[PDB]
Curated annotation (Swiss-Prot):
Cofactor needs: FMN
Any one Gene Ontology BP term: electron transport chain
Protein name: Flavodoxin
Gene3D superfamilies: 3.40.50.360
Primary role: Low-potential electron donor to a number of redox enzymes.
Keyword Transport in annotation: yes
Length: 169
């Protein structure tokens, strides 16, 4: 009815499109979408299950709107919440900072108490470095519409089935 809050930020809409797919994969009224460009850090307190969507830009930078909300995280609490992350990036043009955005967001949110779920395998990706890594895996679903648009849909399906399990749905 109302359990998972998906807060996303997007520059050219790729991340938003993925967010809508994620929503449809979860089932009737489970997930609600929220453009962080119109959100206050306190909106995240209304959910015990969160999905953070954010593309990486300008070589390792958080998407514009997320950058603004990011600064307010240090004053909020995420303890007791399960948080998953996903983002669009470009492993070819920016192999050294692939998906840094979700890595940055995850570090901060986990630091504030959020427990991360939804770890994703790096197998099948071609990149050099990322701030979104932990124990050999991405801290969230890594999508690449610029180079692997053909893999996004099945990657989302797999990830949602994984989260349905990890969220205990
Ligand atoms: C100037 C510029 C810088 C970019 N930098 C990065 C980067 O550092 N890391 C990454 O993974 N992708 C990077 N990208 C690729 C975007 O993340 C990718 O195209 C993404 O799908 C955009 O999603 P959005 O439309 O949701 O903003 C960059 C793209 C441009 C045009």
């Amino acid at each position: 009815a109302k359990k998972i809050g998906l807060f996303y930020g997007t520059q050219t809409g790729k991340t938003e499109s993925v967010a809508e797919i994620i929503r449809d994969e979860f089932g009737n009224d489970v997930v609600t979408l929220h453009d962080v460009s119109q959100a206050e850090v306190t909106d995240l307190n209304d959910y015990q299950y969160l999905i953070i969507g954010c593309p990486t830009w300008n070589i390792g930078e958080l998407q514009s709107d997320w950058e603004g909300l990011y600064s307010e995280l240090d004053d909020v609490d995420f303890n007791g919440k399960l948080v998953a992350y996903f983002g669009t990036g470009d492993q070819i043009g920016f192999a050294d900072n692939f998906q840094d955005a979700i890595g940055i967001l995850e570090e901060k949110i986990s630091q504030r108490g959020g427990k991360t779920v939804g770890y994703w395998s790096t197998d099948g990706y071609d990149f050099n470095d990322s701030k979104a890594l932990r124990n050999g895996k991405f801290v969230g679903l890594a999508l690449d519409e610029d180079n692997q648009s053909d893999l996004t849909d099945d990657r989302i399906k797999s990830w949602v089935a994984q989260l349905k399990s990890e969220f205990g749905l």
